Design a protein around this ligand. Structure first.
Ligand SMILES: *[C@@H]1O[C@H](CO)[C@@H](O[C@@H]2O[C@H](CO)[C@@H](O)[C@H](O)[C@H]2NC(C)=O)[C@H](O)[C@H]1NC(C)=O
Ligand SMILES: *[C@@H]1O[C@H](CO)[C@@H](O)[C@H](O)[C@H]1NC(C)=O
Ligand SMILES: *[C@@H]1O[C@H](CO)[C@@H](O)[C@H](O)[C@H]1NC(C)=O
Ligand SMILES: *[C@@H]1O[C@H](CO)[C@@H](O)[C@H](O)[C@H]1NC(C)=O
Ligand SMILES: *[C@@H]1O[C@H](CO)[C@@H](O)[C@H](O)[C@H]1NC(C)=O
Ligand SMILES: *[C@@H]1O[C@H](CO)[C@@H](O)[C@H](O)[C@H]1NC(C)=O
Ligand SMILES: *[C@@H]1O[C@H](CO)[C@@H](O)[C@H](O)[C@H]1NC(C)=O
Ligand SMILES: *[C@@H]1O[C@H](CO)[C@@H](O)[C@H](O)[C@H]1NC(C)=O
Ligand SMILES: *[C@@H]1O[C@H](CO)[C@@H](O)[C@H](O)[C@H]1NC(C)=O
Ligand SMILES: *[C@@H]1O[C@H](CO)[C@@H](O)[C@H](O)[C@H]1NC(C)=O
Ligand SMILES: *[C@@H]1O[C@H](CO)[C@@H](O)[C@H](O)[C@H]1NC(C)=O
Lengths: 49, 124, 264, 361, 49
């Protein structure tokens, strides 16, 4: 931001934004799958109780 | 949150992210649903009794010694010897410094201990 | 002014196991309790380091210089006083001199016309026998870099059989910046390198922009007939390797481990 | 209104809803740069009496001086000016580690070949740039001085080379190259040619063949403590205040304080745990500091159904009640708008940490 | 590599890398979901036994 001019800075910023978006999406999907597994475990635990 | 992890609190990065659609709402909705599901799981697992029961001071359980698992009175909390042993058996700021917060559980440990003690008292 | 010495004991070089020493700080930044992994030029763990003798017994060979060099000297009264670097060492390439005065170190990147065996001349005749400055080389026509800095004495006196002084230097050449790291240790040993671990403090990364492939040390030295303290230096060659380091809350590098050694 | 905006509806239902984050705004700026130093000799570099050839390009090192590129750019005495890693408008305030100046003379047609990642006569055999370049190329027409009717053919250049050279690899050898099976014997022979040739530079020559004085200003960053900067504006080192700061080009925002960290005499730019930049030592003065980003969090609106009432409560989670600007602090955060009571009821709106809200007379 | 110059072949290689990474990520996610299904079936079979 402090090195480049405005019109050429967006070209660089787009790569970072796409990479971080992909990383966040992967993390969210992994968390969803793990949450489903924990949901199954919790249901089994409640039935056992 | 997205705008802080993805963008370092700058107008240019936020205005560039604004044109990618409603991804942030989807991610936030998914995470909030996950947290609510965790709270529901805890409540469904433990909140199985209508009323909190109280074990009698008399320990004449036919010779069955129950001192290990019953709640410990001479302790700051009500956790038993086994419970405290398990608790003892089983950097944070850095993640929060980039917009990754860790919410506190709805039911604190003392409430779970009370629920467990009530369940044991009712069973015995 | 330089007399080719012949009072030398014909001793083949010895081999020693460079156990763990030779780890330096690769970055100027600070860490605390971090298991950071890095990939840079280092001295491989458990290598064959070459052992010489410098005291009759007089070993003054010229050694190749590639991928830096690790010079570890244990000595009494510090007979070693300087080093030379370059490719031709005959006033045909820019030559580096790091001769260390008892007052201060002088760094000369100049065109030097050395002798065939440029041993450091008699010390008690410089300005004593109506003489002058150096002359291990003939003339210094063109100087490209001149510098003066604090010296490295570190117990320049004494004659003992268990001298504590042991000085380590590592010299690296990247992007025309002659990087020098060094450290002194008071170890009560005789010959072997200690079964210990220590860091290395950077001194100065002065720019050179020169081509270096040869290496020869300078030790203070009538040419035939001398009385000098015991000294012994080891030369090791660096390689590009990956390590995993472990700092401490004080900031010192307290441990390090190799990554291309045995599978564990 | 925030909840209605974020939910895209005019009606809401009883519960707690997350809303936009909050963060403390900065107040002042700190631009402490290194100490006073002499002026850089850029004029000496460009106003040089003589310029060498491309195969013998000069190598000048610039460090430990004050530079002012505003005069360099604003002057009309430069034919073309192309920066490949920075922008001239915001170049002045940057801080550098070291600068390299390379000056020579090029034929007008081939100057375009000096750009990185190009193939040509002067981009394969004599001079080259890397694609990871950050410096700036400045060229100026000098037909009035260099060009001579008698023939200034001392400007020599490599026609061809055995193999292409790596970036920033000067070559001075004049060995006769062999372009055939026969060995190259003697000064001259079949397929044996002198690899150097002299241009044609006369004042009568037109554009394309006019000589041009060309200088390249490369520079390295993130290698050492800064040496070259511009305007200083040494302000202060205020502490415990949410401010902007710029120490050696490391722009940032947060609060500062004196730290007890053990820095060796060559230590700065802490990296305590994560990739984030930790405490740093300021220039012009040797005192260790610290950096901590300003207080922040995410608000939550706690409301009953809009069919019932319009009064709500606000929970600032993760921030102490002291530094927020019927306050009641809980483990979750600073909750305002509701009065704590000693009584205990069922949980209607789950607040957290064993606390729940409700709407009662 | 053999059709273009090295300074301008980075774009095509980058596009290829993005495509292959996307395909690999999709395959991994599908495998994870099907593995969760197989885990549910295995738990049911273990209970029946
Ligand atoms: C039931 O078990 C408890 C636990 O072992 C017994 O209490 C112990 O008594 C011994 C006797 O000296 C003490 O050394 C231990 O410190 C006691 N343990 C605890 C946890 O207090 C108890 O005697 C047993 N019988 C009954 C009737 O309670
Ligand atoms: C050192 O050299 C000897 C003989 O040249 C060899 O036996 C030994 O394995 C070498 N040491 C190492 C660590 O390779
Ligand atoms: C440094 O050592 C050289 C070599 O003996 C000597 O000629 C010179 O006089 C010394 N410098 C000083 C200041 O004594
Ligand atoms: C010193 O430089 C001059 C001028 O560049 C040159 O003529 C002379 O040969 C050089 N001498 C040495 C020993 O480098
Ligand atoms: C240094 O000079 C020698 C002379 O033979 C040469 O082989 C070597 O490649 C040179 N090194 C560099 C880095 O140019
Ligand atoms: C290292 O740090 C610890 C705790 O921070 C302290 O007790 C100890 O004195 C320090 N030692 C040195 C040599 O700095
Ligand atoms: C060159 O010198 C003249 C006269 O001293 C001066 O006005 C001009 O600014 C200088 N320009 C450069 C590029 O050095
Ligand atoms: C520059 O150095 C002087 C002398 O050490 C010091 O007094 C001063 O505070 C430094 N900074 C300035 C002048 O901005
Ligand atoms: C308004 O509607 C809500 C529906 O959720 C209901 O709970 C509430 O009692 C209603 N209030 C009044 C005053 O009708
Ligand atoms: C919040 O402020 C109170 C008031 O002094 C203090 O006791 C408490 O430690 C503070 N909380 C944190 C996390 O610093
Ligand atoms: C009720 O709570 C308030 C605030 O937590 C406290 O000051 C007050 O003492 C409590 N009442 C009793 C009877 O303890």
């Amino acid at each position: 931001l402090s090195r480049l001019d405005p019109p050429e800075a967006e070209v660089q910023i787009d790569r970072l934004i796409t990479g971080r978006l992909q990383s966040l999406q992967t993390y969210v999907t992994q968390q969803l799958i793990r949450a489903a597994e924990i949901r199954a475990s919790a249901n089994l635990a409640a039935t056992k109780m | 949150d997205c705008t802080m992890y993805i963008c370092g609190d700058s107008t240019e990065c936020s205005n560039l992210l604004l044109q990618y659609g409603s991804f942030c709402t989807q991610l936030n909705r998914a995470l909030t649903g996950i947290a609510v599901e965790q709270d529901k799981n805890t409540q469904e697992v433990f909140a199985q009794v209508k009323q909190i029961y109280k074990t009698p001071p008399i320990k004449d359980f036919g010779g069955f010694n129950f001192s290990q698992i019953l709640p410990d009175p001479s302790k700051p909390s009500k956790r038993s010897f086994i419970e405290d042993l398990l608790f003892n058996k089983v950097l944070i700021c850095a993640q929060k410094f980039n917009g990754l917060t860790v919410l506190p559980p709805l039911l604190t440990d003392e409430m779970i201990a009370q629920y467990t003690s009530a369940l044991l008292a009712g069973t015995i | 002014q330089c007399v080719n010495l012949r009072t030398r004991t014909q001793l083949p070089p010895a081999y020693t196991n460079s156990f763990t020493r030779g780890v330096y700080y690769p970055d100027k930044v600070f860490r605390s309790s971090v298991l950071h992994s890095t990939q840079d030029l280092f001295l491989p763990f458990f290598s064959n380091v070459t052992w010489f003798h410098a005291i009759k017994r007089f070993d003054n060979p010229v050694l190749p210089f590639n991928d830096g060099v690790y010079f570890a000297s244990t000595e009494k009264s510090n007979i070693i006083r300087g080093w030379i670097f370059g490719t031709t060492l005959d006033s045909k390439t820019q030559s580096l001199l790091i001769v260390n005065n008892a007052t201060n170190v002088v760094i000369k990147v100049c065109e030097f016309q050395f002798c065939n065996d440029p041993f450091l001349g008699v010390y008690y005749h410089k300005n004593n026998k109506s003489w002058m400055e150096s002359g291990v080389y003939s003339s210094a026509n063109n100087c490209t870099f001149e510098y003066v800095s604090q010296p490295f004495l570190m117990d320049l006196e004494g004659k003992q059989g268990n001298f504590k002084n042991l000085r380590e230097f590592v010299f690296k050449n990247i992007d025309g910046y002659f990087k020098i790291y060094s450290k002194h240790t008071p170890i009560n040993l005789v010959r072997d390198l200690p079964q210990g671990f220590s860091a290395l403090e950077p001194l100065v990364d002065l720019p050179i922009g020169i081509n270096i492939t040869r290496f020869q040390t300078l030790l203070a030295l009538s040419s035939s007939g001398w009385t000098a303290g015991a000294a012994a230096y080891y030369v090791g060659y660096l390689q590009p390797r990956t390590f995993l380091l472990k700092y401490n809350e004080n900031g010192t590098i307290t441990d390090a481990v190799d990554c291309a050694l045995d599978p564990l | 209104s925030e909840t209605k905006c974020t939910l895209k509806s005019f009606t809401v239902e009883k519960g707690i809803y997350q809303t936009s984050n909050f963060r403390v705004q900065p107040t002042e700026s700190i631009v402490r740069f290194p100490n006073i130093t002499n002026l850089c000799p850029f004029g000496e570099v460009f106003n040089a009496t003589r310029f060498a050839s491309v195969y013998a390009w000069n190598r000048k090192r610039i460090s430990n001086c004050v530079a002012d590129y505003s005069v360099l750019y604003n002057s009309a005495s430069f034919s073309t000016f192309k920066c490949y890693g920075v922008s001239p408008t915001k170049l002045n305030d940057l801080c550098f580690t070291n600068v390299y100046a390379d000056s020579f003379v090029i034929r007008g047609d081939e100057v375009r070949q000096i750009a990185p990642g190009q193939t040509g006569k002067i981009a394969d055999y004599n001079y080259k740039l890397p694609d990871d370049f950050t410096g700036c190329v400045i060229a100026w027409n000098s037909n009035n001085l260099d060009s001579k009717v008698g023939g200034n053919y001392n400007y020599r250049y490599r026609l061809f080379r055995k193999s292409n050279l790596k970036p920033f690899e000067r070559d001075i050898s004049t060995e006769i190259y062999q372009a055939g099976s026969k060995p190259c014997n003697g000064v001259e022979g079949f397929n044996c040619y002198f690899p150097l040739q002299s241009y044609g530079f006369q004042p009568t020559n037109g554009v394309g063949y006019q000589p041009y004085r060309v200088v390249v200003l490369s520079f390295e960053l993130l290698h050492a403590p800064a040496t070259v900067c511009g305007p200083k504006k040494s302000t202060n080192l205020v502490k415990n205040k949410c401010v902007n700061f710029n120490f050696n080009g490391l722009t940032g925002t947060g609060v500062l304080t004196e730290s007890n960290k053990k820095f060796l005499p060559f230590q700065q730019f802490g990296r305590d745990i994560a990739d984030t930049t930790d405490a740093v030592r300021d220039p012009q003065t040797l005192e260790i500091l610290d950096i901590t980003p300003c207080s922040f969090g995410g608000v939550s609106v706690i409301t009953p159904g809009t069919n019932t009432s319009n009064q709500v409560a606000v929970l600032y989670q993760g921030v102490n009640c002291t530094e927020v600007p019927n306050v009641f602090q809980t483990r979750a955060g600073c909750l305002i708008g509701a009065e704590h009571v000693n009584n205990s009821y069922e949980c209607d709106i789950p607040i957290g940490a064993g606390i729940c809200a409700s709407y009662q007379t």
